[PDB]
């Protein structure tokens, strides 16, 4: 009921809906999601401006380019074998950056794309950090405890 693909997919999907400013009822986002949307967006804003020039030099023209780019970037970022909550937060930030570029550059505009982004984001998080996340208290006893308002 946490640490599972479904839960992580819902987190990744919530963050994209927030970035894109589309409403998703279902009785509202979890406390975890609310805390994450806040801190991830804070990182996205800073990373966007610092990485501005570099990003102008890539055209995210499709979901496949987004996936490949995401995988290549995430692989280099985590190649040192280190994992922590700060780093996991940046995965969402970069997810947000990607969807924005895709909204502006996607050749065949698809209104479900953010569902497929959320998918491979959760896929990467699952396969590469799932065990670490578990051993560190999961989302509600790890991430939330660390990042919630004091």
């Amino acid at each position: 009921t946490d640490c599972e693909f479904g839960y992580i997919y819902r987190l990744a999907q919530d963050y994209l809906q927030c970035v894109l400013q589309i409403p998703q009822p279902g009785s509202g986002p979890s406390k975890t999601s609310r805390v994450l949307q806040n801190v991830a967006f804070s990182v996205q804003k800073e990373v966007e401006k610092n990485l501005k020039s570099c990003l102008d030099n890539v055209n995210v023209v499709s979901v496949d380019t987004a996936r490949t780019l995401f995988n290549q970037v995430m692989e280099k970022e985590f190649e040192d074998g280190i994992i922590n909550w700060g780093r996991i937060v940046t995965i969402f930030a970069f997810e947000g950056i990607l969807i924005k570029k895709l909204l502006r550059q996607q050749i065949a505009p698809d209104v479900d794309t953010y569902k497929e982004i959320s998918y491979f984001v959760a896929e990467f998080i699952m396969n590469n950090t799932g065990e670490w996340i578990r051993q560190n208290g999961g989302w509600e006893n790890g991430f939330v405890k660390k990042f919630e308002p004091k």
């Binding site: 990182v43 030099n57 970037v73 692989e75 922590n84 909550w85 700060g86 780093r87 937060v89 970069f94």
Partner: peptide, 25 residues
């Protein structure tokens, strides 16, 4: 490429800065 490296390296540094920054046990 240097763009995926430039991206990954910057995300990593931000990630680590945000991490040690948060709680400070």
């Amino acid at each position: 490429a240097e763009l995926e490296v430039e991206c990954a390296t910057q995300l990593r540094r931000f990630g680590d800065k945000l991490n040690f920054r948060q709680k400070l046990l």
